[PDB]
Design a protein around this ligand. Structure first.
Ligand SMILES: [Mn+2]
Ligand SMILES: [Mn+2]
Ligand SMILES: [Mn+2]
Ligand SMILES: [Mn+2]
Lengths: 160, 5, 294, 66, 294, 5
């Protein structure tokens, strides 16, 4: 049942300024300054706790490397054995820890769906699976996305 | 956080 | 394109509790980005404008504050507007903010103007919230579309051959307006040089000449750099944004420079007002203030 | 005046390895790894463009005759 | 030979802009080479070492990274050290690097140990920087004095009868540690054979057995070679250096082999960290990383 | 230059 409200208050204007140049074309009002009312902080929460420049920068450094790689779509039938790949997370640089990783194919299981297909090799980068980005993710988030896949699974793969 | 917060 | 429908839906939340989203379709937002980009490229990179005009500083996705600014200043086309950049990042509603502004640029291209701020730059808005908002509400491809658009924004404006406007400030390298005019778009913002400085530099009352900038890029300039520039180019005033100022405006170097900031209580961590500067036909300058209620 | 900056950040350590040989005496820590900060490339240009292995080999070849 | 004065002058640059030289006298450096040669020859060519110990990989003349390694790992004799070779070449400060390491060898000969790397060989360091540095800063006779010293470095170590350490790696000819122990010093490094292999070979994930090495010398060896070797000599781990690795350390054959590399941003061409491996009294192994600030 | 650069 929100009722917005508007108002104006005048305050003292710009002080007179003596000796400005006669060559100066612009001038400044001495009239009262109108102060218009906007929302309180109670009405309008302007805070945004979701900005995190350290996390974003870490993702961005990873993203920068990926788009030097040529990207290509792969589609696999997920059978009973699974996808026939294992994965490894690697950071964008030395000893980055666990949070913002690129997800590479470490293993391509012989006889498995990825192998029978031919297009996916060890060291390929999994950029996207099931429409979900895997660029700058944890290895557990990646694993979860992969296990949750069913039927014909759509990939974007990077290499080189 | 200076880039400016 | 559906422009009036888009505008209608963006304005529909005027009477709502602030924070309520307007979720346009992806195709709609793509169309605004592509149309406005053509317009920006067809107009000069150094805009040459005539009074009357209202000039606003940073918005930073504070959509409901932008709506108030138009309510009090007059919705386009009642007033002509020049915005000085920083439409996105920090706020929760960068998308609404930039879409409404692009829509007005498209509908009223000769009476509504937008300059590039340091946050209209992929390497900055990746980090300070805009990419996150695009990723959350749309997809990252849409963030890339906005980048292509922002890469075509003009960089500076001269109002009636007397007021030089840009987001940040001066450059030690700026000696001729032709240096701005010859910049080709689309372009990214470099981490050094003329374009960088115009978007990043700050006045400093404690420096004489040119100093190092606390931000880690570009420079600070003193009051005599301002006086010299104005005298050399037969200009009266530098109008810039980029720094939160408690009253929404703040003069520097007597009244040779003004800073405008138009996002009140900025990202809920400052208690500033927002302000706009009106310039009338006789070149009288006045200030209107947007102050949060207590 | 240059002033060196020193610091240490800890990161998750070595994962616990699956089924190790019992006959093995050494073991690997699972405690956090210390990442200590050395000089940036700006502070310390580690490039050496004076190294020329091909010219060196040539003089060496001649020296071995001398 | 005033050891403390020499060490003092070497460490004096610890607070300086990296790159500053320490110019010792020609006689000081000659005294370091001669005294350290007597020590190397009095100790075995295959070192038998006990934990606690910190093990470090290549340094390659990156003098100021070597100082940070000591600052964080503990300056001698606060920690005991084993370096795996490659002290000189590539870097601009090979002289300060080797000089500090020889000083510490002489000062703490039972708590500080240096293995021979493939660059501690006249035919290598003649061409990769060290001769040039000697010739510029001293004279070429100094370079021959270093050769005399290097020709006496031990070539492998076993830590607590469980970690086999060498610069390069394994050799198809290595059946008994007696083949290392019988090597007479001083010796040059030959183009082939056991001593060459120990200083030059590399592990390779793609090879079954022994393969040809892209370096044009020695071999590569696979993970089964490592397993067989370890089982045969009742060892737990091979610790080696010789290859730049991104994290500063890198496991091979599960965790049966580790490569260590202790020159960060190696010769300004890589963005690798350096690392050292600590071995405590209970034979717990851990890693300390040296990563260039942003 | 492979000798390893
Ligand atoms: Mn701003
Ligand atoms: Mn700004
Ligand atoms: Mn080496
Ligand atoms: Mn080596």
């Amino acid at each position: 049942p929100y009722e917005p409200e508007s108002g104006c208050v005048e305050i003292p204007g710009l002080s007179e300024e003596e000796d400005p140049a006669p060559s100066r074309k612009i001038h400044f009002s001495t009239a009262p300054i109108q102060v218009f009312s906007t929302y309180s902080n109670e009405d309008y929460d302007r805070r945004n706790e979701d900005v995190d420049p350290m996390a974003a920068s870490a993702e961005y450094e990873l993203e920068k490397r990926v788009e030097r790689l040529e990207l290509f779509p792969v589609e696999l039938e997920k059978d009973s054995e699974g996808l026939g790949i294992s994965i490894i997370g690697m950071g964008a640089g030395a000893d980055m820890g666990l949070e913002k990783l690129g997800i590479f194919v470490k293993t391509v299981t012989e006889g498995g769906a990825a192998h029978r297909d031919g297009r996916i090799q060890v060291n390929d980068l999994l950029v996207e699976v099931d429409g979900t980005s895997l660029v700058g993710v944890t290895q557990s988030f990646a694993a979860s996305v992969l296990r949750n896949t069913k039927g014909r699974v759509r990939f974007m793969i990077g290499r080189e | 956080x200076r880039x400016x917060x | 394109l559906n422009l009036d429908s888009i505008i209608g839906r963006l304005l529909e939340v005027q009477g709502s509790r602030p924070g309520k989203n307007v979720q346009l379709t992806e195709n709609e937002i793509r169309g605004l980005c592509l149309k406005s980009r053509e317009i920006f490229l067809s107009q000069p990179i150094l805009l040459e404008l005539e009074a009357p005009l209202k000039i606003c500083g940073d918005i930073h996705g504070q959509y409901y504050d932008l709506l108030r600014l138009f309510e009090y200043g007059g919705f386009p086309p009642e007033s002509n507007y020049l915005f000085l950049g920083d439409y996105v990042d920090r706020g929760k509603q960068s998308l609404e903010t930039i879409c409404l502004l692009l829509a007005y640029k498209i509908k009223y291209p000769e009476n509504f103007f937008l300059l590039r701020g340091n946050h209209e730059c992929a390497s900055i808005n990746r980090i300070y919230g805009f990419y996150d908002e695009c990723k959350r509400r749309y997809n990252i491809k849409l963030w890339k579309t906005f980048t292509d658009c922002f890469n075509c924004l003009p960089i500076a404006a001269i109002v009636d051959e007397k007021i030089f406007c840009c987001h940040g400030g001066l450059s030690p390298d700026l000696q001729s307006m032709e240096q701005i005019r010859r910049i080709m778009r689309p372009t990214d913002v470099p981490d050094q040089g003329l374009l960088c400085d115009l978007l990043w530099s700050d006045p400093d009352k404690d420096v004489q000449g040119w100093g190092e900038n606390d931000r880690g890029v570009s420079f600070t300039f003193g009051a005599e750099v301002v006086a010299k520039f104005l005298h050399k180019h037969d200009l009266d005033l530098i109008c810039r944004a980029h720094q939160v100022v408690e009253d929404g405006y703040e003069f520097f170097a007597k009244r040779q420079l003004v800073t405008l900031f138009s996002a009140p209580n900025y990202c809920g961590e400052f208690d500033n007002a927002g302000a706009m500067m009106s310039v009338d036909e006789t070149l009288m300058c006045s200030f209107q203030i947007l102050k949060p209620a207590d």
